[PDB]
Amino acid sequence: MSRAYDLVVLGAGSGGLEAGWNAAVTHKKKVAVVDVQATHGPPLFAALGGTCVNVGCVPKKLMVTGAQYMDLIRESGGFGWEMDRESLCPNWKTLIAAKNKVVNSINESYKSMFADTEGLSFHMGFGALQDAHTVVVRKSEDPHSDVLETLDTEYILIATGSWPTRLGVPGDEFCITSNEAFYLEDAPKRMLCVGGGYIAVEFAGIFNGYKPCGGYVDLCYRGDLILRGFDTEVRKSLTKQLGANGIRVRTNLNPTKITKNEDGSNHVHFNDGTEEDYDQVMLAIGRVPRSQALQLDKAGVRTGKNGAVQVDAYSKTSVDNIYAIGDVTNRVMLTPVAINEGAAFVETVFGGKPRATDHTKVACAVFSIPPIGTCGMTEEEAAKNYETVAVYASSFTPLMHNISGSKHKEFMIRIITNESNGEVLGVHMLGDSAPEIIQSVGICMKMGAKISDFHSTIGVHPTSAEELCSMRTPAYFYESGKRVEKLSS
Amino acid sequence: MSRAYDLVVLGAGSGGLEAGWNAAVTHKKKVAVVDVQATHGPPLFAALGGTCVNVGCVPKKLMVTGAQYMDLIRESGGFGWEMDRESLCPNWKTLIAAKNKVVNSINESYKSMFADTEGLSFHMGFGALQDAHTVVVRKSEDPHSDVLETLDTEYILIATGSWPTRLGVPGDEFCITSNEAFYLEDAPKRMLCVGGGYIAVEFAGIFNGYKPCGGYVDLCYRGDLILRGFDTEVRKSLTKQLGANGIRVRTNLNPTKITKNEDGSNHVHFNDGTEEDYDQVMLAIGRVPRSQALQLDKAGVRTGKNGAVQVDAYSKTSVDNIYAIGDVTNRVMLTPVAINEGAAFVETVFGGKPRATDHTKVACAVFSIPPIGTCGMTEEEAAKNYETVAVYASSFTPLMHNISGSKHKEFMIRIITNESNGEVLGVHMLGDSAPEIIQSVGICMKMGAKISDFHSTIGVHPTSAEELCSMRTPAYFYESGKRVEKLSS
Numbered sequence: 001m002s003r004a005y006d007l008v009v010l011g012a013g014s015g016g017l018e019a020g021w022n023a024a025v026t027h028k029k030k031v032a033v034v035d036v037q038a039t040h041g042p043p044l045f046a047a048l049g050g051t052c053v054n055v056g057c058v059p060k061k062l063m064v065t066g067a068q069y070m071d072l073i074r075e076s077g078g079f080g081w082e083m084d085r086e087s088l089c090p091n092w093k094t095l096i097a098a099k100n101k102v103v104n105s106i107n108e109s110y111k112s113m114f115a116d117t118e119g120l121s122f123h124m125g126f127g128a129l130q131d132a133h134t135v136v137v138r139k140s141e142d143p144h145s146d147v148l149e150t151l152d153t154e155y156i157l158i159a160t161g162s163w164p165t166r167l168g169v170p171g172d173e174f175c176i177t178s179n180e181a182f183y184l185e186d187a188p189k190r191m192l193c194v195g196g197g198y199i200a201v202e203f204a205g206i207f208n209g210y211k212p213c214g215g216y217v218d219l220c221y222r223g224d225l226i227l228r229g230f231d232t233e234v235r236k237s238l239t240k241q242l243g244a245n246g247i248r249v250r251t252n253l254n255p256t257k258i259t260k261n262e263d264g265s266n267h268v269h270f271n272d273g274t275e276e277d278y279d280q281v282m283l284a285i286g287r288v289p290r291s292q293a294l295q296l297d298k299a300g301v302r303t304g305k306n307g308a309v310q311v312d313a314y315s316k317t318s319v320d321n322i323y324a325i326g327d328v329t330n331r332v333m334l335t336p337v338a339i340n341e342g343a344a345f346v347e348t349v350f351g352g353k354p355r356a357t358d359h360t361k362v363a364c365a366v367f368s369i370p371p372i373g374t375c376g377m378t379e380e381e382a383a384k385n386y387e388t389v390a391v392y393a394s395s396f397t398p399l400m401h402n403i404s405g406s407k408h409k410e411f412m413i414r415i416i417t418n419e420s421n422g423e424v425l426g427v428h429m430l431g432d433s434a435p436e437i438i439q440s441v442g443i444c445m446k447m448g449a450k451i452s453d454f455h456s457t458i459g460v461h462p463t464s465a466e467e468l469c470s471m472r473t474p475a476y477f478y479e480s481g482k483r484v485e486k487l488s489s
Numbered sequence: 490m491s492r493a494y495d496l497v498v499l500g501a502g503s504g505g506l507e508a509g510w511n512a513a514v515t516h517k518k519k520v521a522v523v524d525v526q527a528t529h530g531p532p533l534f535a536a537l538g539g540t541c542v543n544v545g546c547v548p549k550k551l552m553v554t555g556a557q558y559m560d561l562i563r564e565s566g567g568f569g570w571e572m573d574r575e576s577l578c579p580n581w582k583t584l585i586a587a588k589n590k591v592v593n594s595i596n597e598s599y600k601s602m603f604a605d606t607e608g609l610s611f612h613m614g615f616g617a618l619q620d621a622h623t624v625v626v627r628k629s630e631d632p633h634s635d636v637l638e639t640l641d642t643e644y645i646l647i648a649t650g651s652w653p654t655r656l657g658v659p660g661d662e663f664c665i666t667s668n669e670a671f672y673l674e675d676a677p678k679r680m681l682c683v684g685g686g687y688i689a690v691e692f693a694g695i696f697n698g699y700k701p702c703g704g705y706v707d708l709c710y711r712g713d714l715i716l717r718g719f720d721t722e723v724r725k726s727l728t729k730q731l732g733a734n735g736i737r738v739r740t741n742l743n744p745t746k747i748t749k750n751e752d753g754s755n756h757v758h759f760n761d762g763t764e765e766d767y768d769q770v771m772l773a774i775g776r777v778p779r780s781q782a783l784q785l786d787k788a789g790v791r792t793g794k795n796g797a798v799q800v801d802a803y804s805k806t807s808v809d810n811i812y813a814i815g816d817v818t819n820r821v822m823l824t825p826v827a828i829n830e831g832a833a834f835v836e837t838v839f840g841g842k843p844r845a846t847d848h849t850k851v852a853c854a855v856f857s858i859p860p861i862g863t864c865g866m867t868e869e870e871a872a873k874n875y876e877t878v879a880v881y882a883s884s885f886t887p888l889m890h891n892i893s894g895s896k897h898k899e900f901m902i903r904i905i906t907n908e909s910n911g912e913v914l915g916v917h918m919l920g921d922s923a924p925e926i927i928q929s930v931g932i933c934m935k936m937g938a939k940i941s942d943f944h945s946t947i948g949v950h951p952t953s954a955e956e957l958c959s960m961r962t963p964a965y966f967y968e969s970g971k972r973v974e975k976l977s978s
C-alpha cells in the first residue's frame with residue numbers, strides 16, 4: 001500500500017455502512033467511515049446508521065405500530081373486549097421515550113461493531129472533498145470550520161443521502177419536517193400535514209392515532225389525488241379510508257403564509273383564501289440529495305437535477321475512483337435499494353466481480369393505515385409501453401370486519417399484466433398485511449411470473465393473500481394505449 | 490337426456506358446492522346437491538357450506554382473531570395506551586353471537602345462490618347410495634328412515650368430508666370436540682385440550698384468550714412434541730411461546746378415564762396417575778372420513794384406511810361414474826385442496842379437459858398464537874429423498890417487541906433446499922403474518938424457485954418477510970441422510 005485508506009465512505013447510512021462493512025470484513029480493506037454524529041437527535045437528526053435507523057423507516061414504523069392500536073382497541077369491542085373507551089388517548093411521551101430507547105440501542109450496537117471490526121474506523125464530523133484521493137473531515141458544515149482530519153484514500157464513496165425540501169413561503173421557518181416530528185414534546189391537538197407523498201400520509205396516520213381529545217389532523221395536498229405514481233384505484237380507496245378514520249384530506253390546496261400566534265400556535269393562510277389555526281404544521285413536500293455542502297466542484301463530480309450525483313449502472317461518477325449510492329444519486333430512494341447498490345459496489349471494485357443494481361420490479365410499501373404493498377408498473381405506465389395490457393381487480397372486506405365494525409376496511413388487489421404472454425407487470429395491494437405479502441410477490445415478479453402462475457397455485461385459507469390466486473377474468477383492457485372494455489382487433 | 494340429473498353431489502362442502510356450481514353455470518348441467526341442513530348448529534353442526542364455513546376455518550379464525558386481542562391490548566401499554574388491565578376478561582357470549590351472525594349470514598347467501606342458479610338445486614337430508622346411478626335422500630342417518638326423494642343421476646360425487654374421532658375411554662362421552670366448542674354457553678375456567686394437531690393448538694389459543702379470571706388451559710399430548718409433520722425447530726419454538734403466553738403444555742400424557750363431578754365439572758385421571766378437575770375437556774385427536782353411513786357397499790365403492798374412498802389422480806372411484814373429493818378421500822385435508830379437486834373434476838368430466846390436482850408444494854397455515862406459515866418438505870423428509878440438502882435458518886425479534894414487552898415473540902424462518910441445484914424444497918415460518926407471507930411463497934415454489942431467487946430479490950423494509958431475502962449462508966447440511974456441519978467431497 002501507498003495510501004492510508006482503501007475506502008473513505010461519506011455517510012454511515014443504509015448504503016454507506018453496508019459497503020464499509022463488506023470491504024472491511026469480506027475483503028480485508030482499510031475502510032474509513034464518516035458521519036455527522038454517533039447517536040440520533042437534534043440539531044443534526046441523522047447519525048451513525050443513517051436516516052432509516054435514526055429518523056426514517058425504523059422509528060417511523062414503531063410510531064405507526066403505536067398509532068395502529070387506536071383502531072385495534074376500538075375493534076376489540078365487537079369481539080367481547082369491554083373497557084372504558086370514551087375519552088381514551090395515548091401517551092405521546094412514553095412512545096417517544098420507547099422509540100428513543102430503541103434507536104439509541106441500535107446506535108450503540110454500531111459503536112461496538114466498529115470496535116470489533118478490524119480495518120473499519122468511524123470518523124465523526126462533516127466530510128468534504130479536496131481531490132480524487134483526499135477527504136477532509138471538518139468540525140461543522142461551514143467550509144471554514146476546523147479540519148479534524150485529512151483522509152488520504154484510494155476510493156471515495158458518497159452515501160450522504162437526502163434532506164427535506166422547504167416551502168419557500170412567508171413563515172416557512174415556523175414549520176416542522178419529518179426530522180423535528182420525531183422529537184415533538186407533545187402530540188399536537190390541531191395538526192396539519194402538507195404534501196401527498198408516502199411520508200405525508202404515514203405521519204398523518206401517526207398523529208391521527210396520538211392526537212389528544214378534540215384533536216384532529218388535516219392532510220393538505222396541492223394536486224388532485226394523493227400519492228402520485230401509485231395505482232389510481234388504490235389512491236382513491238386509501239383517501240376514502242383515511243377519511244373514514246378521521247383524517248380530513250384536502251386537495252388542490254397550498255399554504256400561502258404562516259404567522260405565529262402569540263399563544264404558541266400557528267395561523268395558516270391557504271390557497272383558496274381560507275385561514276386556520278394549527279398547533280403544528282409539518283412539511284413533507286420533497287427530499288433533495290444532500291450534496292450541496294460536499295465541495296463536489298473541487299473534485300469535479302457532475303451534479304445534475306437538484307444536486308444528484310450522476311452515476312452509471314455501477315455507481316461510478318464523472319471521476320473514475322469516486323462512487324455514489326443511495327438517495328444522493330436520486331434514483332429509487334429506498335433503504336434496501338441503497339444497501340443493494342452498496343453491496344454491488346463492493347462486489348465490483350474490491351471483489352473483482354462487477355454487478356449492476358436492478359432498479360426494476362422493486363417492491364415497496366407505504367405504512368399508512370391501512371398499509372399499501374406495491375411492486376411493478378401502474379396500468380397508466382404499462383399501457384404506454386405495451387401493445388396489449390390486461391387489468392385484474394378484486395375488492396373484498398374480510399369477514400372479521402363484520403364483527404370489528406371497521407366495514408370501511410376493504411382489501412384491494414390489482415394485477416397488471418402484458419396480455420400478449422401473461423407476464424405480471426404490476427401488483428398493487430391495499431389493506432392489512434400488504435407490506436408483508438408484497439415481499440414474496442416481488443420474488444415472483446423477479447422470476448418473471450405470469451398470471452397463470454398465480455391462479456394455478458392452491459390458496460391458503462383463510463387469508464387475505466389467497467385472493468391473488470383467485471383472479472382469472474380480467475376486469476378490462478388496454479389496447480395500445482386506450483381503455484377497452486372488451487378485446488378485439 | 491334420459492336421466493333426472495347429470496350430477497348428484499353428496500355434501501354441500503368446500504369441494505361439493507364448488508363442483509356443483511361449476512357444472513351448473515359453466516356447463517349448464519342439471520346438478521343436485523345434498524346436505525344435512527340449511528344453517529349451522531347442533532345437533533348436526535355441519536351444514537350448507539360444509540365444515541369450513543360452519544364449524545371450521547371461518548368460525549375458528551374469527552375466534553382466533555378475538556383471542557388475539559388479549560396480547561394486542563397488553564402490548565399497547567408500552568406504546569402509551571393506558572387503561573384498566575387488571576381483572577380484564579372478554580365476553581365469550583358476544584363473540585359467539587358475533588360468530589353466529591356471520592356464519593348464518595353465509596348460510597343465507599347460499600340459499601339465494603341456489604334460488605338464482607338454474608340447474609342447481611339443494612336437497613336437504615342424509616344421502617346414501619343404491620347403485621351407480623341412484624342416490625336416496627333419507628330423513629335421518631338411520632338407514633330405516635323415511636326416503637325423502639330418490640335422485641336418478643348420471644354421475645355421483647362424494648364430498649361428505651370428515652368427522653372427529655373419539656378417545657374410546659371410560660367417560661369419553663363427557664368430552665367435547667371442535668363441533669361443540671363452537672357452541673359453548675360460557676368460556677370455561679379450567680380447560681383441557683387433548684391432542685397435538687393444528688386444531689388442538691389453535692383452540693388452546695382461543696380458550697387462553699377467552700378464559701375468565703384465574704382461568705387456565707392445559708394442552709395434553711401423548712407424544713414428545715406437538716404438531717407432528719412440522720419443522721422441528723418451529724414446533725419447539727411454538728411450544729416455548731405457548732408456554733410464555735400462559736398455556737401449560739403437557740407431553741407423553743393421556744386421559745385414562747373421566748367421571749362427572751356432581752357440581753358440573755369433569756374429573757380426569759391421567760396416564761402418569763395424576764388427577765385434575767376441568768370445567769371442559771376437548772378432544773382434538775383425529776378426523777376420519779365420513780363414509781360409514783353412505784351404504785358404499787351397496788354401490789361397491791372401495792374404502793381403504795379408516796373408510797377413505799380410494800381414488801386415482803382424477804378422483805375416480807372403483808365405480809367408473811362415481812367420484813370422491815376432499816376429506817373423505819383422506820389426502821391433504823384442506824379447504825382449497827378440496828375446492829381444487831372439485832374444480833379439476835368438473836374440468837375433466839364435463840369440460841372434456843382432464844386435470845389432476847397437484848398435492849405437492851401446497852402451502853398451509855396454523856392459526857395458533859403466534860401463527861405458522863408452511864410450504865414444502867421438512868428437513869427430516871427432504872434428507873431421506875435427496876442426495877445433498879442445505880438447511881437455512883434465521884431467528885429474530887421484531888424491534889416493536891422491545892416496546893411491546895412481548896420479547897418471547899421471535900419470528901423464525903427456515904428454508905430447506907436441494908444443495909445440488911439450489912431448488913427450494915421447503916419454507917417454514919413462525920410468527921405474526923406467517924399465513925399471509927407463505928401464500929406468495931407457495932407461488933414461488935410452484936414455479937420451482939431456487940435459493941438464489943430469494944436473496945437476489947431486493948427487500949421491503951421494514952417487514953418480517955424481508956428476512957427471506959437475507960439468507961445466503963446455510964446453517965448446516967444433510968449429506969445423503971445424515972447431519973453434517975460443513976460439506977466434504
Ligand SMILES: Cc1cc2nc3c(=O)[nH]c(=O)nc-3n(C[C@H](O)[C@H](O)[C@H](O)COP(=O)(O)OP(=O)(O)OC[C@H]3O[C@@H](n4cnc5c(N)ncnc54)[C@H](O)[C@@H]3O)c2cc1C
Pocket residue numbers: 010011012013014015016034035036037046047048049050051052053055056057058060125126127128159160161162178199290293294325326327328333334335336338367950951
Ligand atoms: C420519514 C422517512 C421514512 C422513511 N421510510 C422508509 C421506509 O419505510 N422504507 C424504506 O425503504 N425507506 C424509507 N425511508 C428512506 C430511507 O431512509 C433512505 O432512502 C435511506 O436511508 C437512504 O440510504 P443512504 O445511505 O443513501 O442515506 P442515509 O441512510 O440517510 O445516510 C446518510 C448519512 O450521511 C450523513 N451525512 C450527510 N452529510 C454528511 C457529510 N457531509 N459528512 C459525513 N456524513 C454526512 C447523515 O448524517 C446520514 O446519517 C424513509 C425516509 C424518511 C425521511
Ligand SMILES: Cc1cc2nc3c(=O)[nH]c(=O)nc-3n(C[C@H](O)[C@H](O)[C@H](O)COP(=O)(O)OP(=O)(O)OC[C@H]3O[C@@H](n4cnc5c(N)ncnc54)[C@H](O)[C@@H]3O)c2cc1C
Pocket residue numbers: 460461462499500501502503504505523524525526535536537538539540541542544545546547549614615616617648649650651667688779782783814815816817822823824825827
Ligand atoms: C376446527 C377446524 C378448523 C379448520 N381450519 C381449516 C383452515 O384453517 N384451513 C383449511 O384449509 N381447512 C381447515 N379445516 C379443514 C376443512 O374444514 C376441511 O378440510 C374441508 O371443509 C373439507 O371439504 P369437503 O368438501 O371435503 O368436506 P366439508 O366441507 O366438510 O363438507 C362436507 C359436507 O357434507 C355433509 N354430509 C356429511 N354426510 C352427509 C350425508 N351422508 N349426506 C349428505 N350430506 C352429508 C356435511 O353436512 C358437510 O356439510 C378445518 C377443519 C376444522 C374441523
